Every structure is written in C-alpha cells, then in structure tokens.
C-alpha cells in the first residue's frame, strides 16, 4: 500500500509537470525526488541515512562518510553517456536513503540523460533480471549496465507511453506487481 | 624479489624496535608502516592512492572520497575487540594504497589490539583460506573474521616466535612462499 501510494506520487510527478522543477544531477535533486515519491509514507523521505546497509553481498557507502561521498559524487561530469552512467553507478553505491533508492535514482538518471543527451531510458523494454544483474556488477565493471541501457535509449523523452510504462517497470524492479 | 626485500624490512621493523615508534590506530601510522615495508620498492610507498581498485567482486572505497573516508575511519573507537575489528574492517574497505594493504594493515591491527587489549593475533595459527574468506565477507558481516581471530589471540605480545612466524604467515596470505 506504501508502494501503491508512491506509484501514484511518481505518476503525479510527471503528469503535473513538477518533474520539470527538480534540480538535475545533484544530491538535493535526488532528495527532492525521494521526498516527492515517499513524503508521508516513509518517515525518512528526503533524508540521508545514518545507518549502514548492504544487499546481496555488497555493503553500500558507509554512513559515517556518506555525506562527504555525495559532495564528490554530485560534482562528477555529465557530458557523455559513459560519464553519466559512471555518475549513476557511484550514486547507486552511495545508496543515500534507507529505502526507495532504486526508484528515485532511476528518475534522477533520466533527468541527467535528458538534460545532456536529450534521451531517456525506455525502461519498459529493460528486463528486470538483466537490469538487477547489471546493477549488482556495476561497482566492479559497468559494461553489463552500459550494454543494457545504451540499447534502450529513446529521444522521445515526453511520450506518455514511454514515461508511464517506464514508471510501471521501474516499480516492478522493486517487486511491485 | 620486491616481496623478499619487503619481508626483510618487516623483520627489521620488529628486530630494531622501530615498531614501537609507529603511531597507533591512525591513518598516518598505517602510512608509516607501508613506507617502512615498501620504501624504495614501490614508488607509491606511504602514499594514498588516486586510482580505483577492486578484488574478487568488491570495489574498495572510491579514490575521490578516500581521504575523507580515512579521516572518519581513524576516529573510530578502539576499546573492545569488537570495536577494533570493526575499525580494521573499515580500514580494509578503504584499502588506501595500490598494493601492500593486507600486510601493512595487519601490522596496524596488531598495534591497536596490543595497545588496547594487550594482545595480538597469533597469525601462524590462522589459516590462509579461512582468513581470506573471512576478509572477503567482512563488509557484509564480520562474524567469520571475529570467530577466526578471537580464537587466535595471544597475550605473549613480544615473543620472537609469534612475531616472526606471524610475519611469515602474513606474507604467505599474499602468495609469498
Ligand atoms: N548487490 C547490489 N549491488 C549494487 N546495487 C544493488 C545491489 N542490489 C540491489 N542494488 C540496487 O539497489 C536498488 C534497490 O535499492 P532500494 O533502496 O531497495 O530501492 P527501491 O526503489 O526500494 N527498489 P528497486 O525498484 O529494486 O530499485 C536496485 O535498483 C538495485 O539496482
Ligand atoms: N574481495 C575482497 N573484499 C574485501 N577484502 C579483500 C578482498 N580480497 C582481498 N581482500 C583483502 O585485501 C588484502 C590484499 O590487499 P593487497 O593490497 O593485495 O595487500 P598485500 O599485502 O599486497 N597481500 P595480502 O598478504 O593478501 O594481504 C588481503 O589481506 C585481503 O584480506
Ligand atoms: Mg526497497
Ligand atoms: Mg598485493
């Protein structure tokens, strides 16, 4: 039900045009996204975590230096696809919230791609299994992730079907329907 | 041959008493150890790396925020075995040099244990296979490492056989003889 309400928030972010007022490629902008999706649902919406977390055998950036890491991550360049993916990979390693990192940071990635390349990821055609494998591998080698995403870019960045079917797939990655 | 010369340096560190002049539990003290073992052998002896490195599927702390991470890691408490191991685990995640992290940081760990608990690890009885597995797991859960090391502590901290057979085993962990 938390997931269902945040899915409505995600849809409203785009329907309302509020997506166009989110700061692009910064820590604050990621926090804006997270606050929009999870405000009133998670107590920690928008807030940088103070606890440590791991998933599938990988420990995300230690909370004691997470703030410092985010200051450096947000300054990374965004000129090319390769640089943008590298920045995304580091933001994923940071994993700045207790929950909802995946959904918020994918929206954050699309904004950076859209601003710098005039493209976004056509998530509806990006397999859950291949996406999750590629993300798990990305800290060591982002080849899997680059191969996957580059083949699924679209320049039709405001198309309703791409946007809304993409949001649905994004939520599916986290286990919702 | 680099390994053989640094093994002589490691032995001399203890034989000479120079070990007693190394700063305990700090980043600078780890750099002193590394400089002592590898000075004149690696160009980067004592120097915090600027490149990224991974091993066995784990990416060590990103070079762009490594300095910041080390400032926080060195401030971690050292009062109990559990705290000391937690500090060691984070220093291993930092992996501040291009090479020689294992050998230098194990000496660094013994100094912290010796200062705070009046014990050191009896490395000669600590299996290579179990040690390397336990270190690989430690970022997610340090249970393996704690179980292994706690069973192999000794209060005979200046005993020549414990020290020199321990150095030999430490070098063996890295693949030397
Ligand atoms: N072992 C791992 N290493 C690196 N990244 C991972 C790992 N496991 C999961 N991830 C990423 O972390 C994200 C999940 O973080 P989480 O805070 O659960 O976000 P979410 O929005 O709640 N769920 P999701 O829809 O899966 O992104 C996923 O998008 C994965 O790509
Ligand atoms: N996948 C991993 N995750 C976490 N730590 C690891 C991993 N692989 C190796 N290590 C640790 O990293 C150390 C090796 O770092 P390195 O810079 O090669 O030091 P070294 O002194 O040259 N060799 P060693 O004698 O094995 O410690 C080892 O002591 C391991 O315990
Ligand atoms: Mg989640
Ligand atoms: Mg080595």
Residue with tokens 């995640």, as numbered in its chain:
B93
Q: At A4, which helix (H) or strand (E)?
A: helix A2-15
- CA distance to partner chain B, nearest, from residue A86 (Å): 12
Half-sphere exposure of A74 (CA within 13 A, CB side): 17
- How determined? X-ray
**Separation CA B138–CA B133 (nearest Å):** 9
Q: Which A residues 17-56 touch B at CB under 8 Å?
A: 54
Q: Residues with beta carbon inside 6 Å of ligand 1?
A: A 55-56, 58, 92, 99-103, 132, 135-136, 173-174
d(CA A61, CA A53): 8
Does residue A58 contact residue A22 with C-beta atoms inside 8 Å? no
Helices (H), chain A: 2-15, 27-38, 66-73, 81-94, 101-117, 128-137, 143-150, 160-173
Cα B92 from Cα B61, distance rounded (Å): 9
Whole-angstrom Cα Rg for chain A = 15
Q: Residue A127: how many CA atoms within 13 Å on its side-chain side?
A: 9
Residue A79: name the closest of A117, A46, A48, A41 by CA. Answer: A117
Rounded Cα gap, residues A162 and B122, in angstroms: 61
CA-wise closest residue to A97 among A154, A162, A32, A2: A32
What is the rounded distance in angstroms from the CA atom of residue A46 to the CA atom of residue A39? Answer: 8
Look at A62 and B72 and tell me if their CB atoms are within 8 Å: yes
**Rounded alpha-carbon distances, angstroms, from residue A93 to A73, A163, B18, B41:** 10, 25, 39, 34
Beta carbon pairs, A and B, within 8 Å = 47
- Give the list of residues 6+ apart from residue B82 with CB closer than 8 angstroms, or none: B146
Domains, in order of start, for chain B: 1-177 (1.10.3290.10)
Indicate the angle between helix axes A81-94 and A143-150, nearest 10 degrees: 120
In chain A, the residue whose alpha carbon lies closest to the alpha carbon of B58 is A140
Which two three-digit tokens encode residue B23? 């700063």
DSSP-assigned beta bridge partners for residue A120: A154
In sequence order, which ranges of B16-150 are alpha helices (DSSP H)? 27-38, 66-73, 81-94, 101-117, 128-137, 143-150
A162 touches chain B (CB under 8 A): no
Tokens of B95: 């992996």
C-alpha span between A139 and A91 (Å, rounded):
11
Separation between Cα atoms, residue B164 and residue B123, nearest integer Å: 10
Burial label for A91, CB within 10 Å (0-12, 13-18, 19+), is buried
Closest by Cα among A144, A142, A161, A162 to A153: A162
The two three-digit tokens of residue A135, written as one number: 């993300």
Tell me whether residue A53 is exposed, middle or buried, using C-beta atoms within 10 angstroms of its C-beta: 0 to 12, 13 to 18, 19 or more.
middle
Measured distance CA(A100)–CA(B103) in Å, rounded: 39
* CB B96 near ligand 2, within 6 Å: no
CB B83, CB B76: distance < 8 Å: yes
| Angle of helix B27-38 versus helix B66-73 axis, rounded to 10 | 110
B116, two tokens = 């705070």
Euclidean distance between the first and the last CA atom of chain A, given in angstroms as a whole number: 12
- CB-based contact, B93 to chain A, within 8 Å: yes
Among residues B63, B54, B55, B13, which one has the least CA distance to residue B34?
B13
Cβ-proximal residues to A7 (8 Å cutoff; 6+ apart), any chain: A167, A168, A171, A176
Which residue precedes each gap in chain B (C to N above 2.5 Å)?
Answer: none
Minimum-distance CB partner of A140 among B57, B72, B73 = B57
Stretch (H or E) spanning A132: helix A128-137
């Amino acid at each position: 039900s938390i997931d269902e309400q945040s899915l409505h928030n995600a849809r409203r972010l785009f329907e309302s045009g509020d997506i166009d007022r989110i700061e692009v490629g910064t820590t604050a902008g990621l926090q804006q996204i997270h606050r929009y999706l999870f405000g009133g649902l998670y107590d920690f919406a928008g807030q940088i975590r103070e606890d440590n977390i791991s998933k599938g055998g990988f420990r995300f950036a230690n909370a004691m230096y997470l703030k410092e890491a985010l200051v450096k991550i947000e300054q990374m360049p965004e000129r090319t696809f390769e640089e943008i993916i590298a920045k995304y990979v580091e933001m994923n390693i940071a994993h700045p919230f207790l929950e909802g990192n995946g959904r918020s940071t994918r929206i954050w990635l699309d904004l950076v791609l859209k601003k710098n390349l005039k493209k976004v990821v056509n998530w509806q055609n990006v397999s859950k299994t291949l996406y999750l494998q590629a993300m798990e591998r990305s800290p060591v080698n982002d080849l899997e992730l680059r191969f996957l995403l580059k083949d699924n870019l679209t320049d039709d960045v405001d198309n309703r079907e791409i946007i809304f079917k993409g949001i649905e797939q994004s939520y599916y990655y986290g286990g919702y329907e």
